[PDB]
Design a protein around this ligand. Structure first.
Ligand SMILES: O=C(O)CCc1ccccc1
Lengths: 121, 121
């Protein structure tokens, strides 16, 4: 769900997930996808493209189990969809941390309706 | 559009609109409505209910003209829909400023998918 997604992003980046990534760019947080704005945004593009196959689970609401073991996100889920969902969230969390170097605060509270359409997944 | 709306909220409250009201509560900013969580959220519940009386104007994208005169938002505006929309945005801006006294930061980046459903407008 959004709870696990948020903890993962916090754990990886060390930043408040809802505040930095809840409305970042044309892809991250609320809503769907659009043309990415930078690498941080492109992380979430893939993240949502990754969500697309889970038809599945509710990526926002369905909870799942995972562990923070030696500063590594370990998905511990039986249930195919939830396991895939957890791996989606793990990936984006990692990607977000790797691209902290180009995090732009000007995209933090982006107005998404004015985003250009995204390429299909 | 979101630009005039955000400017209004800034002018009345003195606060960053996207940051304070972009994802506040179950009703402020992105998405639809849910059960209000305080007075400030309820100011956006009304705001979104007000959008539903419009006649084909786009509340998120359509620009309109307004003036900041004697510290009052004065909707100019030709085009009747745009004017009602301007009045809708003006209302919530004032309402948001009037209810700054009970603004709760813990609702700032609220997780809206877990909000309980709103009544019909
Ligand atoms: O963005 C923050 O970290 C806190 C911001 C804030 C600014 C003004 C009043 C309350 C909170």
């Amino acid at each position: 769900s959004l709870f696990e997604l948020g903890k993962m992003i916090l754990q990886e980046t060390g930043k408040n997930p809802a505040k930095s990534y809840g409305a970042y760019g044309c892809n991250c947080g609320v809503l769907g996808r659009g043309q990415p704005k930078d690498a941080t945004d492109r992380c979430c593009y893939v993240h949502k493209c990754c969500y697309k196959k889970l038809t599945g689970c509710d990526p926002k609401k369905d909870r799942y189990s995972y562990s923070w073991k030696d500063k590594t996100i370990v998905c511990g889920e039986n249930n195919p969809c939830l396991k895939e969902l957890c791996e989606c969230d793990k990936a984006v969390a990692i990607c977000l941390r790797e691209n902290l170097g180009t995090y732009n605060k000007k995209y933090r509270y982006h107005l998404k309706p004015f985003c250009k359409k995204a390429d299909p997944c």
